[PDB]
Amino acid sequence: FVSLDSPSYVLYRDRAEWADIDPVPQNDGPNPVVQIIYSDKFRDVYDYFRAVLQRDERSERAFKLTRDAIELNAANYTVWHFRRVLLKSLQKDLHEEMNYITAIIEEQPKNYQVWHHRRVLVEWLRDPSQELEFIADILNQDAKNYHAWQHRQWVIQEFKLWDNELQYVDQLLKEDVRNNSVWNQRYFVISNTTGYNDRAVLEREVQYTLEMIKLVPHNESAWNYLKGILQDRGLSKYPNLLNQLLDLQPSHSSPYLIAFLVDIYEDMLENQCDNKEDILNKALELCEILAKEKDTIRKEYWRYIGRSLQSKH
């Protein structure tokens, strides 16, 4: 009806249709701590919300009242909950509410309550038709919004919408190959569809990642994805990978490559490799280089790895 900043907005204590109900002021105790000096509009709304909640009034006026409480503070989870309680009682049109929550999330996408309210609506309607597009728009404003990606994984999983997600991943990686949220989605999609056990899928993934590394050698995400898709089997189980990384050595060296080499040696030693002394020595040299020169911020970690390698092999 009338927005909180609308020129004809009227305080609740002045609305005739609300005169029958007494407002419930918030009791902070005689000596208030962390006491917020609320604006008159804010307090006014919350004094009435407190009253309807207390009376558990499932009315249409209470329902509209929650919209104002939400504009005043969209993080008030109690208001959102009571609102969901009203959507059910009043049997409100959920597609209407979907439009509302779509608007809300657009203004403030970094909020836990709003994304949850949307999820509840989608579950109630068992209708996911709008999700991937809406999320894609939010992600279009912040390609890394955590809640956006989380809600997205949920809808895809719950409603089996796997079909186009890998193309989506590829498009976003094209836009920003450093977007870690996208590399994460890539893992999510693949492990939940074809899996990585299919050697053809694994090779495709390893080739793709290596290409990305060669284009942007210092992009950490690609390096992390590469170790991520190979670590479960063991890095020493892919003998060609060592040689290929060593080739990149001069022309593409970086703390990431050197670190990856240590990981490989780590696993090799762990797996009864030949030349244990040689590999141990190569690995220890790298730990020293990373600790003293190439990755000094992680000196303590690299020194620790060096000591581990020595106590084990």
Binding site: V24, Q26, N27, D28, G29, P30, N31, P32, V33, V34, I36, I37, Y38, S39, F42, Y46, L53, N73, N76, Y77, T78, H81, R84, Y112, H116, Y146, W149, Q150, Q153, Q157, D176, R178, N179, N180, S181, N184, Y187, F188, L215, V216, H218, N219, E220, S221, N224, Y225, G228, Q231, S254, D295, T296, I297, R298, K299, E300, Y301, Y304, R307, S308, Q310
Partner: protein, 410 residues
């Protein structure tokens, strides 16, 4: 050595310039944002250097104290957005004063106690303000505040029988917990439940059945832990996950090796502070969420007899983190912040100081080793890595409640 009025800084070493981002001539929003932050940070680092003269860093205690003291009583309507987070304001402020070793006047202590009583729901748990529904986050905050206070008056405000029933009412069959009735589910709830439950002695055999396994499912390919299974590794969720598992004595459920490599990589080579997830920006609050994982991993590894563990350092750059916090996260007017150019706030004041304290103090067994960068007065009170309230407060609180029975059980 060098004169006492001059202390060489890691961030100011000439080699440090080599730690600037290398975008490989391929710009994306990510490299661009990172470069802007680094650019600003460089200017800040430079302002503390006067050729060979490098004055000791100083933690503006008084300025922070006045800021905290002022906020514990009243706040502007700019704080209307935190109307459902009041017990957090109490916890952020009290823990900060606690780290700074500023005492809490008993009048204020009692007033805070009374307020949290008003936030406590009749069904158990604490709401974000008087009359609001219980929610695990403010419940966690309130219990910690009460523990920081340490008086029996504080301890007793907690209605334990209802607190246990409440936790039960949020327990899901798969091991997770709702943040509140009809609320979202993510790893924060597991930590909140495990924290309050252990501190107040209300853990039953079934309460956390399946929780450890659910949390492990949150550990992803990166090594960190995401909010829910499948989601991106994030320091906030990783802290919650590991700390929870430590409380449950189930750290071994995680691949500690990949967790360690992940968290150590989250420390920014140039800034010295920590980022929340790979390829995102540095932020002072991660000084606690990320760096706090190291004391936890240390304890976990030491527990399983790791012979290579250090006996004097956490596996992160303690100096660099302190440099970042002291040089880039202090507001001239008091309070601490995310990064240069951000407004101060109580949340960051709390976490920047918590991280500073962890970066300053190492301990394992009877092994102690401090690294207080700057003037000696910079040294803060130690903080417990699992609960993030003083270690003394933890023992005292758990001792008190251990003298009570678990609500309606055995």
């Amino acid at each position: 050595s060098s004169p006492v009025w001059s202390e060489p800084l890691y961030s100011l070493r000439p080699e440090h310039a080599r730690e600037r981002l290398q975008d490989d001539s391929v710009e994306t929003v990510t490299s661009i944002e990172q470069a802007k932050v680094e650019e600003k940070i460089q200017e800040v680092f430079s302002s503390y250097k006067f050729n060979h003269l490098v004055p000791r860093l100083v933690l503006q205690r008084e300025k922070h104290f006045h800021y905290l003291k002022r906020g514990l009583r009243q706040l502007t309507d700019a704080y209307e957005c935190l109307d459902a987070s009041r017990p957090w304001l109490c916890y952020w402020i009290l823990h900060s004063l606690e780290l700074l070793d500023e005492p809490i006047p008993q009048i204020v202590a009692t007033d805070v106690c009374q307020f949290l009583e008003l936030c406590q729901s009749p069904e158990g748990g604490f709401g974000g303000g008087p009359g609001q529904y219980p929610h695990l986050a403010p419940t966690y905050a309130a219990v910690n505040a009460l523990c920081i206070i340490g008086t029996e008056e504080a301890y007793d405000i907690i209605n334990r029988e209802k607190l246990l029933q409440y936790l039960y009412s949020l327990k899901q069959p798969d091991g997770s917990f709702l943040m509140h009735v009809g609320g979202e589910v993510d790893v924060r709830s597991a930590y909140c439940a495990a924290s309050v439950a252990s501190l107040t002695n209300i853990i039953t055999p079934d309460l956390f059945e399946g929780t450890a396994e659910w949390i492990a499912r949150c550990q992803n390919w990166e090594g960190g832990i995401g909010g829910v299974p499948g989601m991106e590794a994030h320091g906030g969720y990783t802290f919650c996950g590991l700390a929870a598992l430590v409380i449950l004595k189930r750290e071994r459920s995680l691949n500690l090796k990949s967790l360690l490599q992940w968290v150590t990589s989250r420390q920014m080579r140039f800034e010295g502070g920590f980022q929340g997830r790979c390829n995102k920006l540095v932020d002072g609050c991660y000084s606690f969420w990320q760096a706090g994982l190291l004391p936890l991993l240390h304890r976990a590894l030491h527990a399983q007899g790791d012979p290579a563990l250090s006996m004097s350092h956490w596996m992160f750059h303690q100096q660099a983190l302190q440099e970042y916090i002291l040089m880039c996260c202090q507001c001239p007017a008091g309070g601490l912040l995310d990064k240069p150019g951000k407004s101060r706030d109580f949340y960051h004041t709390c976490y920047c100081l918590s991280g500073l304290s962890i970066a300053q103090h190492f301990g394992s067994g009877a092994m102690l080793h401090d690294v207080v960068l700057g003037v000696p007065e910079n040294a803060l009170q130690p903080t417990h890595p699992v609960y993030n309230i003083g270690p003394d407060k933890v023992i005292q609180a758990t001792t008190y409640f251990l003298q009570k029975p678990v609500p309606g059980f055995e």
